[PDB]
Every structure is written in structure tokens, then in C-alpha cells.
Amino acid sequence: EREELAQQYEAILRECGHGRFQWTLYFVLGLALMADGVEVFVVGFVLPSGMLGLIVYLGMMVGAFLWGGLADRLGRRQCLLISLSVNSVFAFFSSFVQGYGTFLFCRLLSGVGIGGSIPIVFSYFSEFLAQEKRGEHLSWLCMFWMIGGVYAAAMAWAIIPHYGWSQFHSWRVFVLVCAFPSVFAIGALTTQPESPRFFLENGKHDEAWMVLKQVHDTNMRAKQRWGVRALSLGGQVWGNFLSCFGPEYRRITLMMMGVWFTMSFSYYGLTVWFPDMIRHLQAVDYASRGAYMVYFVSFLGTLAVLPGNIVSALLMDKIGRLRMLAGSSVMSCVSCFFLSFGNSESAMIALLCLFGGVSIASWNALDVLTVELYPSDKRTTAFGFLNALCKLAAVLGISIFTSFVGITKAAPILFASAALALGSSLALKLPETRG
Numbered sequence: 001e002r003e004e005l006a007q008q009y010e011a012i013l014r015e016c017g018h019g020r021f022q023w024t025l026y027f028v029l030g031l032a033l034m035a036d037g038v039e040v041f042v043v044g045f046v047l048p049s050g051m052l053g054l055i056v057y058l059g060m061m062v063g064a065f066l067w068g069g070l071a072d073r074l075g076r077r078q079c080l081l082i083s084l085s086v087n088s089v090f091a092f093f094s095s096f097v098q099g100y101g102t103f104l105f106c107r108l109l110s111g112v113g114i115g116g117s118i119p120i121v122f123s124y125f126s127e128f129l130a131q132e133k134r135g136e137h138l139s140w141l142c143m144f145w146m147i148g149g150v151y152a153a154a155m156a157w158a159i160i161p162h163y164g165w166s167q168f169h170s171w172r173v174f175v176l177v178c179a180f181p182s183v184f185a186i187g188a189l190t191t192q193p194e195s196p197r198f199f200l201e202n203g204k205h206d207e208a209w210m211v212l213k214q215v216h217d218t219n220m221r222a223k224q225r226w227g228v229r230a231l232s233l234g235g236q237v238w239g240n241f242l243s244c245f246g247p248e249y250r251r252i253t254l255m256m257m258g259v260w261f262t263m264s265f266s267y268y269g270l271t272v273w274f275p276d277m278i279r280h281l282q283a284v285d286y287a288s289r290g291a292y293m294v295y296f297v298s299f300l301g302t303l304a305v306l307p308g309n310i311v312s313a314l315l316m317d318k319i320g321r322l323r324m325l326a327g328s329s330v331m332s333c334v335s336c337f338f339l340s341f342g343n344s345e346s347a348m349i350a351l352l353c354l355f356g357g358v359s360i361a362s363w364n365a366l367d368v369l370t371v372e373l374y375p376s377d378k379r380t381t382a383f384g385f386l387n388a389l390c391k392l393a394a395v396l397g398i399s400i401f402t403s404f405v406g407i408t409k410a411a412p413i414l415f416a417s418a419a420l421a422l423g424s425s426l427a428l429k430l431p432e433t434r435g
């Protein structure tokens with residue numbers, strides 16, 4: 001069967017152990033995730049400078065599902081290469097455009113390219129990690145999203161600190177420097193093999209043996225008519241997506257959808273309500289008598305997330321994944337309640353940092369759970385579907401929370417708190433990755 005092969009694969013991985021190969025691949029996929037973080041920041045904060053920049057999220061969901069589904073039939077390295085190439089190509093194109101139409105079309109296609117970054121990188125990394133400590137290592141890899149977010153925030157604060165709302169223009173230079181991480185990720189990933197789990201599942205056992213030999217050698221330095229092809233490939237992708245909701249994985253997938261949607265909705269609503277709330281406070285304080293404030297707030301908020309991820313990774317395996325996920329979701333809800341006490345910009349930044357640092361642990365734990373609960377034959381399909389669900393949640397939360405801006409700080413707080421409470425409730429029902 002396929003369960004007995006998993007035990008053999010885990011035995012080979014454990015016998016080899018961690019080493020150079022895993023860390024090199026860790027940095028490669030870290031660059032790949034840095035690209036995704038950069039694009040998320042760019043869409044969330046830079047593109048509006050109005051509401052029509054959400055097209056990039058709406059394309060990120062499509063790309064996430066498409067690349068996740070394809071990665072099971074074609075490969076994690078090949079499909080990640082294709083997706084990162086699309087993202088880099090269109091991010092590079094965006095710089096030379098001369099209007100918002102072409103600019104947003106290029107950003108939409110680059111978002112389609114980068115949508116499948118997270119699913120494929122997480123499945124691809126988890127397929128090289130032994131069960132002994134893969135939670136801590138996936139949590140370590142989660143850091144690179146924060147690195148990319150802070151990188152983009154710093155480059156925006158340094159390059160274009162002024163609004164477009166009243167390579168030559170500063171924003172074009174910012175665009176291409178933000179595209180750089182994708183190019184570095186592609187260049188790094190071209191030097192990596194293909195995950196042997198995918199080869200073994202497809203039937204290329206000899207290629208899986210070659211990949212495992214490469215891993216061991218690297219670690220040893222330590223211690224129309226023809227259109228039926230596309231039609232059938234899409235058919236396999238659809239069949240895997242439908243099997244994710246089969247007699248088994250239906251309850252698991254529904255719980256995963258609920259928790260992922262709650263987390264993403266809350267986070268993406270709040271991180272767009274925070275700079276807007278601070279800016280409205282500044283406006284009313286100047287009335288009590290240009291854009292680099294948003295980028296500085298984003299830089300601080302995404303930088304504050306990194307200590308939380310340091311603590312999460314070191315404690316992911318010592319404590320667990322259900323315990324971490326629950327103790328992070330309820331703490332995120334509590335911090336959403338605390339958001340009321342942020343009655344001034346000074347406190348608003350501190351509460352934003354607190355919320356991010358508290359919440360990163362639930363995302364780490366849920367990554368590990370979603371890669372440990374789905375077999376390799378549907379890991380990337382389900383992960384890409386849930387990433388598309390998260391992007392839709394991000395669009396919905398951004399829209400709602402930006403509609404709340406300047407009216408009341410209790411509606412965003414209660415929306416996020418209810419979302420996180422429902423997410424924590426559904427997370428408590430998630431089965432332990434063990435079963």
C-alpha cells in the first residue's frame with residue numbers, strides 16, 4: 001500500500017539524519033518564501049498607493065490552487081520553478097509599465113505566480129525532514145516570510161517614502177528590488193533535486209533512490225487530439241481535489257478550512273486596520289490643533305513576529321502541535337480583545353507587535369499539521385486549496401476592516417476576535433498529526 005511505503009521512507013530519512021542538504025534546501029525554500037512575503041506586503045500596503053489592488057490577492061488564490069494541484073502530478077521543484085518564474089517575470093515587467101491598468105495586470109499575474117509558493121515549499125521541505133524534528137525545522141523555515149516582509153518594508157521606507165496619490169521613478173526601483181528575492185530563489189532552487197517522496201509516489205523509484213543518494217552524499221560531509229494530455233492532467237488534479245473531501249480527509253479538510261480561514265481573515269483584516277487606524281489617529285491629532293509611516297509600521301509589526309517564531313520553533317516538538325495551535329489561537333483572540341487599550345499610536349504599534357508575535361505560533365503549528373495530516377499524493381493539492389482559501393479570507397478581511405476604518409475600533413476588534421475564537425474552536429477539534 002501507500003502507508004507501508006511511508007514507513008520505509010521515514011526509516012531512510014531517520015537513518016540518514018539531518019545535515020548539510022537539509023540546511024541548503026532550507027535556505028533555498030527560505031528565499032522562495034521570502035518572495036511570497038515580499039509580494040504579500042507589496043499588495044497589502046504599497047499597491048493601494050485604491051481598493052482595486054486586491055486583484056493581486058484574487059489572482060494569488062487562483063495561482064495557489066493551480067500550482068498546488070499541479071505539484072502532485074508534475075513535481076514540487078518543477079512546479080515551484082514555473083510559479084517562481086512567472087512571479088519574477090511579471091514582477092520585473094511591472095517596473096517598466098506606464099499605467100495602472102498594465103501595472104495591475106502584471107501584479108495580478110505575478111500574484112498568480114507567487115500564490116503556490118507557500119504550499120509547494122512547505123510540502124517540499126517536509127518531504128525531506130524526518131519525523132523526529134520536522135516541526136521545529138518547518139517553524140524555522142517559516143521565518144523567511146517575516147524576513148521578506150521586513151525586507152520589503154525597509155526598501156519601501158527607504159526608496160518610496162511618499163505617496164503616488166499626489167527604473168527611473170522611485171517606485172519602479174522599489175518594484176525591481178522587491179522582485180530580486182524571486183530571482184535569487186529561482187537561482188538557488190535550480191541547484192536542488194526533486195523530492196524523492198514525489199518520485200516514489202509517481203512510480204519513479206530509481207529517481208527517488210538517486211535523490212536519496214544525493215541527500216546522503218551531501219550530509220556525509222558532516223558529523224486538439226494530443227490535448228488529451230492536458231485534459232487528463234487537469235482530470236487528475238480535479239480527482240485529487242475531490243479525494244481530499246473523500247470518506248477520510250473530509251472532516252480533516254473541513255476543520256483545516258475553518259481554522260485557516262479564521263486565522264487568515266483575522267490577520268489580514270487587522271494588519272490593514274492597524275496602519276489605517278494609526279494614520280486616522282494622526283489625522284485627528286493634527287486636527288486637534290508621506291507614506292513612510294505605513295511602511296515603518298509594517299516593518300515594526302513584521303519584525304516583531306520573528307521572536308515569536310524563534311520561540312515557536314524551539315518549542316514545536318517539545319510541547320506539541322495541537323497544544324501550540326490552541327495556545328496560540330486563544331492568545332491571539334485575547335490580544336484582539338487587548339487591541340481596545342491601544343488608544344494612541346504609541347500603543348497601537350505595541351499591540352500590533354504583540355498580536356503578530358502571539359499569532360505566528362498558530363501558523364507554524366498549522367503548517368506542520370497540514371503537512372503531517374495529508375499524504376504526499378494530495379499534500380500540495382490540499383495545501384494549495386487551503387492557501388487559496390486563505391487568500392480569499394485575506395481579501396474579505398481587508399475589504400471589511402478597511403471599510404471599518406475611521407468609524408469604530410470595536411467592530412474590527414470584534415470581527416477578528418470572533419474569527420479567531422471560531423478558529424481556535426475548530427483547531428481544538430483537529431486530530432493530532434499522529435492520527
Ligand SMILES: COCc1nn2c(CN3C[C@@H](CCC(F)(F)F)CC3=O)c(C(F)(F)F)nc2s1
Nearest residue numbers: 118142145267305355356359360363367387390
Ligand atoms: C495563506 O495560508 C497558507 C499559509 N500561509 N503561511 C504563511 C504566510 N503568512 C505568515 C502569517 C503571519 C501571521 C502573524 F500574525 F503571525 F504574523 C501571515 C501569512 O500569510 C506561513 C509562514 F509565513 F508563517 F511561514 N505559513 C503559512 S501556511
